[PDB]
Amino acid sequence: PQITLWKRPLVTIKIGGQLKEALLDTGADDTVIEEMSLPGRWKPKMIGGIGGFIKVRQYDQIIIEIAGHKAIGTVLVGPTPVNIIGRNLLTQIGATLNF
Amino acid sequence: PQITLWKRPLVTIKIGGQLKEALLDTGADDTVIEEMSLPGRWKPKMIGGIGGFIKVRQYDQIIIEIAGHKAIGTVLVGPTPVNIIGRNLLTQIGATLNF
């Protein structure tokens, strides 16, 4: 699809068996999802943006379905105010910015 | 251009006659630039990033060139980890996300 930017570029994702709404976010290096359980190993991480840093759990090799497209990669889980699909998974679905 | 996302989508901007680097950020509603001098009056604005809310200075109707494209619009000045070009100006340069 071509998504214009008049509005937030929100899509439906499926992660850990759950449907969520998330932002397609070219400004995020990694994907960050609100608190949820995911299976497997994780390690703590700090990530920072406007307003400072939050602590997250880093899960590797997690499969997401993003607007119907499957991608695998790292997901950071923590108290983000918005679910964010970052570049580490946008690349996998072939997303580009065009102008 | 068609910009892939394997690397950060950094571009050159020109504001106040100065060249700066900024991140094209589809997850930002607003354009936020590090401390600099801009003409005219400003108004207060609170924006909510990943780590919490901050105060910024809102300057309206500012001339800014983005990757060689002319835009005139609102620029927020405040403590951001990197200069970000948000949807308010991404729409002025005709940007879309595509996959």
Ligand SMILES: COC(=O)c1coc(-c2ccc(S(=O)(=O)N(CC(C)C)C[C@@H](O)[C@H](Cc3ccccc3)NC(=O)O[C@H]3CO[C@H]4OCC[C@H]43)cc2)n1
């Ligand atoms: C380091 O290894 C990694 O890959 C890794 C490391 O760190 C990260 C990592 C991943 C994401 C973030 S971030 O969410 O903070 N962010 C980074 C940018 C600020 C550089 C992504 C933004 O798109 C963010 C996304 C956002 C959206 C809403 C609420 C909160 C955040 N938007 C945002 O702050 O926009 C503000 C300006 O316009 C307004 O509209 C929206 C809020 C406000 C930071 C670190 N990733």
Ligand SMILES: [Cl-]
């Ligand atoms: Cl990854």
Ligand SMILES: [Cl-]
């Ligand atoms: Cl590619």
Ligand SMILES: [Cl-]
């Ligand atoms: Cl450029």
Ligand SMILES: [Cl-]
């Ligand atoms: Cl604007």
Ligand code: NA
């Ligand atoms: Na894992």
Ligand code: NA
């Ligand atoms: Na000033």
